[PDB]
Design a protein around this ligand. Structure first.
Ligand SMILES: Nc1ncnc2c1ncn2[C@@H]1O[C@H](COP(=O)(O)OP(=O)(O)NP(=O)(O)O)[C@@H](O)[C@H]1O
Ligand SMILES: Nc1ncnc2c1ncn2[C@@H]1O[C@H](COP(=O)(O)OP(=O)(O)NP(=O)(O)O)[C@@H](O)[C@H]1O
Lengths: 663, 267, 661
DNA sequence: TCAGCGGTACCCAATTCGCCCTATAGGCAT
DNA sequence: ATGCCTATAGGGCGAATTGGGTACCGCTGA
């Protein structure tokens, strides 16, 4: 009815870290509430009968109205002792298999709580065998192992080739590519927001083609706005911004006809800012140079005094031409040419043969090998008005350009909203393109955890392959909550597992899903195991402790272990555990044919396998999921198909029938 | 066992007494969150480990008073046994003994206040090693802090080149000015180095160390004997710089033996 | 006694690609000779009775003095058909398991040779069962599987922490970090060049500390020289170059005392450009600004006329102060202040109350909220002499600065040699410091393939592990040419395998190796395997690996059933002990393979003994003659965090399975 | 061909973090 | 009391370090 709960809390410069312990059950939890009200709600929720705090706790207001308070030293909340003590408590070499290793803020609380727990109790605490991170936000729970393995945004090498990004990233502008990458990093699980996107994407499927060229004109407006705030923006950045402003009347017209209130809401957030368009159109030249440094940025008609100091530098070539002409006529020297030099200034060069036939008005400035350059008062006067007018017109150009920041920054906030909205439109319209092109379906969300796929396919593997993906369906529910996927190597069982993982993630960005028809339930935690044991078994334990009734478990080859008796026996207990105790959503791709005796042993487990036909040494993989189990080994048949010599394959078949003669 | 450098001192000695020619002395957070001493000395059996804690004087002076993790493998074919906190289970470790101990401070709030900041406290730990280093030129000592390897005192072969490691302990400043001494009258044998008082600078004046059959004793008798020698060569009586080694059969005569040894070397 | 041999060749803008075939035996091969003489030597070596070339072959001079020549079309040498045709010929889905997939230049020759072979013969040629690439550079042949696994420059995650780089990369300058990294991806096998480094590294062991601070002053001279050649160099780059030039007298003195002819040679290759030192010392200010755009680069005393145009801009503040003072006295307005403005130039500001009390000489330039700014002929005249002198002094600064490229580029070649030598010194002295620091030994090279390690250790793992590395002894030779390393997880299966791989590579950069004593033989190819695909990489190692190659097979047996991976592993081990006789390391969990030392000659049973005490376990981490006693995942499972209740269910299911066997 | 033209990798270079150090007091056996 | 020693904490300076700016690199329809 009512509990006796113990807890602890600590903070750094970043945020807060929290931990608890019930001595009745032996539950030991962790969290990192980032803000204050979240932290106050977490204390209010748990309601510990005894609460720890470090002597130097800054935000004391939280704990000054709580009961059974305990002032503790600082050193007790140090991560060094915390990690060391908790590692020997659980007996592990790391706390990675609790999924809390990279939560040091919270482990300061946990570390201080256990040191205190071992001292408060000093009793039998083997009912404490684990800790787990219960995130303050449960909108989505994703491990870096998924992000690196599924290759959502990043392949194994580190690039973005044959990822879910590469596929979905046909986005015309880079700020669209990034918002796409973030959404995949943070799949929204708020049913309303997910349906907001699915109704948006459905309406733009047809209108996608018209808007996409208009979005490619914008460029990266988001990063231009960043430099605008820093007062480090460049002319060709402002040129892109103006080019983007001209498209807002066009986009407001195309999206006005579209039937989707979310689109009409995005269309208003899109805005127009036709005043800020007018400013930049009048201010800047159509295509100015790279930097402001050497001017030629602000167009004539904007500033009258810019045009004044320009008019001095503009009355340049004609002034020298008429001098060059008059002096060529008067002297009778046709090699006479009036030109500029950065070093000496302007001059009058005459060929060496005609050099000393020049008049007495000319003063020697520069003696050359092939000529004699001179200077005269008219030029040396005109030399001054140019050099200075250049710098002052250019100086006015720097100042005006920085003044344009003072004119744009009043709308800075509204432009970021617009830029985010334009970036969002590129993503949404890009997804609406992908859904239109590949005939992706809209998955609808149910109350209980389960994915029902009808002829579904791997959204990435299908695009790169030179054969249409053998799309296969799925039927997950808390009744059919695990599938033992046996079969061959290149059988497609890691694919059908990873295809299911993307489908869930793609469904949870409100994007149309790679299938004919999907109905999916709440998936809070997407856990994955990545092959290559001290890497493998650590992740599996994390997924045992952390995974819930609602979590999606993606086991790949639990069994790359020291034998076929350790790996099976573990995998066996893991399958039982997730069917008996957790009763969680599990996909168990394995080569342990002995585990195919679990559908008869367990309730919730179901035998499936990947059909393959082998003729001779060559083998062909149907890549189709069938209800049943694997026929036999297939590595022998694959080995040759991977290049392995027939001297090995024959010796494999010769050693096979020496081992297969036993069993 | 009040200063963190004290814990070191005892434990680093504990290795030398086991006949060690390699000492891995390691620390973190200026000796507040790691005190690790690993040796290539003689190991200690699963039997002797238990009641040594529950050298046996010093181990127990820190063991139940800290989170002490004492592991060792006897040179005799065995499996490295390991204790904690009073619990023996086996590790795997080379021939010798290792004490990866965390701060003694546990139930004493006042002993935390006694802590004189840190960095300064690892600088005091350094001095302990720096002293012990000069005492034993046959033992290798690699000193590390925060995981960063700090100082590297490598064992010189018997009657080899002592100056490198000497210079590692006493910096490049002294090494240059180091004038070697070799005095001998009967049972008494004096060895070591002296910086030439002519080129003795403020930086060198930090070095004043005198070792007597391994053990260093801070005795004022020697201060007179040395500052008598530094006065009666050149007029200037500034702060001296020296590292000296006297071997005696197990007072005022020894004072006179010292003085005579110095003045002859300097000229 | 000569055979009928067939060949083909093609070239792109990059280099050449080559292929051959003997119709008697069926041996089909591949190469990419980069230069001409290498390509001429390869034709001369093989000596094909029939030789193919594409109609548009550029360097015809090679083939116009050869016999049985065949002019072929271009499209036949296209990679698309080549890959497609050769894939279906071998029956593979890729040519990755031949180690030629990323050698398209050579596959144009191989592709065109087979299309010709299928047309010359027009019968079944199952004798053609494989192809293989031979980049037999003095450089060791390594698949990227090794570089991603060994973590030479990059760990599994993609960072450069817990690498062999991170460890050995205590290099003071970046150009040292890179030459270190290139050596580790291109290990020298010219035993003479390796001994040149080992004699160098042994001599600098003592002097390592004193040279290292001097090398940290240099900075990245190598990339500064690249910008100097491009005529795009920055003042701060030339400042670093001068700071580096000052260290050359110092380094020439320290290395003169060192006893190593290779060091004395490198010291000469370092050379001295004290003439270029004098130029930059006189020319440039001690620390100039970021760009030449801003001026304030070239120091006074270098150019007379630079200082002339500067002197105009320097007679500024005193001219305006005396104006400000005189005009404040004359008018009787004390709020009168003469200041500069980037936009408008210089001016004379007076407070709004005193603004219209100013004299008739003053012309309005700028009206403010709080004041009235003016301009006068004396200022507007002085305004000209400043603005123009700035630009002309600044223009002279740009020109002089580019002229310094015409003064330095005569030595450009000699500076690259010096920079390479300085970069090489940082590497060598860094390794001399690492070998001094980490107590590394000098491995000596023998005639036949084999590594004899005495209390060796993993050069990376030992450094980052809190506990000491349990040293492992190894004895590889053509007599003991394979080791079945069965054992627990945290047994040290992977460590002792990968420790051996680094030891070989570290020995083949002439650097002192992580061991008490090593004697090593010729290792040409280092081939490695790890879980992400599997069969693809293993096959490459099978086909490519020779009597001399180092094979590092890791858990072959991640298969479809117990039988397909045991049978393959047993066959691959037999193959590499029966046929190929390569120096092979086959860490694995298959205790069933421990029946091969009695089956095979050259195979030897070893294991990483683990003694389980209480509920917990100790791993000796020491290689023992024998095999694994039992399964260890059960013991590890708990150590990976797993609840003890499924470990219990594991032990409860274990004894249901162990009751059979 | 072609002239921008935006991207993109990569070398800085002020900024951030950690290490040193010297005036500034205390400190404790005498 | 006391007087020479001794650690100390803020301040200064140096060493990493990642964002910002630049020179370069294809390249993209036109
Ligand atoms: N449905 C599918 N349609 C077509 N090709 C597929 C399909 N599923 C998988 N593949 C191909 O199968 C190969 C690898 O399949 P995968 O599922 O990884 O094999 P596995 O049996 O899981 N063994 P493993 O490679 O160790 O993971 C690749 O060439 C895939 O493109
Ligand atoms: N000789 C050794 N000395 C010290 N630690 C070692 C040694 N060998 C292995 N280890 C440690 O053992 C752990 C991993 O061992 P490793 O051999 O890489 O794995 P394994 O036994 O092959 N199993 P797996 O993790 O699947 O690769 C790490 O903590 C290593 O530091």
């Amino acid at each position: 009815r009512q509990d006796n709960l113990l807890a602890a809390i600590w903070q750094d410069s970043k945020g807060f870290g929290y931990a608890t312990l019930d001595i009745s059950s032996g539950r030991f939890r962790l969290s990192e509430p980032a803000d204050r009200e979240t932290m106050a709600a977490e204390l209010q929720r748990t309601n510990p009968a005894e609460l720890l705090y470090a002597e130097d706790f800054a935000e004391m207001s939280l704990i000054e109205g709580r009961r059974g308070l305990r002032r503790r030293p600082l050193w007790e909340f140090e991560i060094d002792t915390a990690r060391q003590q908790l590692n020997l408590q659980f007996g592990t070499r790391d706390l990675v298999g609790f999924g809390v290793e990279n939560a040091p803020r919270g482990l300061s609380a946990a570390g201080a709580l256990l040191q205190y727990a071992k001292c408060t109790q000093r009793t039998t605490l083997p009912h404490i065998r684990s800790i787990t991170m219960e995130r303050e936000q449960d909108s989505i729970i994703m491990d870096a192992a998924t992000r690196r393995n599924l290759e959502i945004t990043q392949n194994l090498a580190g690039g973005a080739e044959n990822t879910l990004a590469s596929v979905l990233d046909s986005t015309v502008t880079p700020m669209g590519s990034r918002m796409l990458k973030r959404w995949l990093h943070m799949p929204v699980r708020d049913t309303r927001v997910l349906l907001e996107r699915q109704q948006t994407i459905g309406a733009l499927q047809d209108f996608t083609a018209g808007l996409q060229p208009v979005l490619r004109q914008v460029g990266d407006l988001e990063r231009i706005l960043a430099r605008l705030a820093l007062r480090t923006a460049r002319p060709r950045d402002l040129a892109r911004m103006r080019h983007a402003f001209q498209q807002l009347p066009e986009l407001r017209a195309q999206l006005e006809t579209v039937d989707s209130a979310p689109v009409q809401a995005l269309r208003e957030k899109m805005g127009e800012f036709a005043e800020l368009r007018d400013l930049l159109e009048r201010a800047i030249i159509d295509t100015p140079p790279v930097l402001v440094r050497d001017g030629g940025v602000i167009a004539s008609g904007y500033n009258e005094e810019l045009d004044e100091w320009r008019a001095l530098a503009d009355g340049a070539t004609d002034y020298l031409e008429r001098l060059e002409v008059r002096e060529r006529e008067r002297t009778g020297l046709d090699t006479l040419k009036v030109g500029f030099n950065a070093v000496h200034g302007y001059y009058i060069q005459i060929s060496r043969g005609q050099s000393h036939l020049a008049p007495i008005n000319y003063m020697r400035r520069q003696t050359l090998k092939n000529a004699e350059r001179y200077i005269i008062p008219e030029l040396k006067e005109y030399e001054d008005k140019v050099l200075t007018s250049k710098g002052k017109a250019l100086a006015l150009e720097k100042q005006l350009y920085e003044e344009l920041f003072d004119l744009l920054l009043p709308h800075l906030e509204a432009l970021q909203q617009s830029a985010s909205a334009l970036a969002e439109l590129d993503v949404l319209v890009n997804l609406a393109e992908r859904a239109y092109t590949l005939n992706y379906t809209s998955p609808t969300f149910i109350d209980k955890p389960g994915i029902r796929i009808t002829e579904g396919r791997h959204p990435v593997v299908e695009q790169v392959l030179n054969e249409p993906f053998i799309a296969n369906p799925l039927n997950l529910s808390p009744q059919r909550r695990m599938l033992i996927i046996t079969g061959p190597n290149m059988g497609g069982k890691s694919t059908y597992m990873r295809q299911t993982a993307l489908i869930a993630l793609m469904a949870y960005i409100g994007s149309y899903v790679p299938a004919q028809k999907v109905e999916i339930g709440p998936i809070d935690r997407i856990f994955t195991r990545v092959g290559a044991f001290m890497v493998e078994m650590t992740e599996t334990a994390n997924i045992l402790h952390n995974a819930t009734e609602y979590s999606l478990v993606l086991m790949d080859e639990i069994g790359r272990g020291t034998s076929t008796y350790d790996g099976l026996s573990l995998a066996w207990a893991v399958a039982e555990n997730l069917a008996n105790k957790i009763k969680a959503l599990t996909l168990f791709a394995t080569h342990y044919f002995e585990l195919t005796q679990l559908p008869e042993k367990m309730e919730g487990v179901a035998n499936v396998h990947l059909d393959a036909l082998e003729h001779g040494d060559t083998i062909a993989f149907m890549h189709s999921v069938q209800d049943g189990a694997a026929s036999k080994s297939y590595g022998l048949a694959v080995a040759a198909l991977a290049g392995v010599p027939k001297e090995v394959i024959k010796r494999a078949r010769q050693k096979l029938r020496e081992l297969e003669s036993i069993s | 066992v009040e200063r963190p450098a004290s814990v070191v001192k005892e434990l680093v000695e504990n290795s030398l007494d086991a006949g060690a020619t390699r000492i891995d002395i390691d620390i973190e957070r200026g000796g507040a969150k790691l005190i690790r001493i690993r040796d290539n000395g003689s190991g200690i059996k699963k039997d002797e480990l238990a009641l040594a804690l529950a050298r046996g004087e010093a181990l127990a002076s820190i063991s139940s008073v800290s989170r002490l993790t004492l592991t060792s493998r006897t040179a005799e074919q065995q499996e490295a046994w390991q204790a904690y906190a009073v619990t023996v289970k086996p590790a795997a470790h080379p021939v010798g003994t290792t004490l990866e101990v965390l701060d003694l401070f546990y139930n004493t709030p006042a002993r935390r206040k006694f802590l004189r900041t840190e960095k300064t406290e690892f600088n005091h730990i350094d001095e302990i090693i720096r002293r012990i280093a000069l005492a034993r030129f046959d033992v290798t000592i690699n000193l590390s802090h925060n995981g960063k390897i700090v100082r590297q005192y490598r064992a010189v072969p018997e009657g080899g080149q002592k100056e490198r490691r000497l210079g590692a302990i006493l910096g490049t400043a002294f090494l240059e000015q180091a004038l070697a001494i070799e005095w001998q009258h009967g049972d008494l044998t004096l060895r070591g180095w002296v910086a030439d008082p002519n080129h003795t600078t403020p930086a060198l004046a930090e070095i004043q160390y005198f070792y007597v059959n391994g053990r260093m004793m801070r005795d004022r008798l020697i201060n007179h004997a040395i500052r008598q020698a530094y006065e009666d060569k050149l007029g200037a009586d500034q702060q001296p710089a020296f590292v000296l080694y006297l071997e005696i059969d197990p007072s005022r005569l020894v004072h006179d033996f010292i003085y005579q040894g110095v003045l002859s070397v300097l000229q």
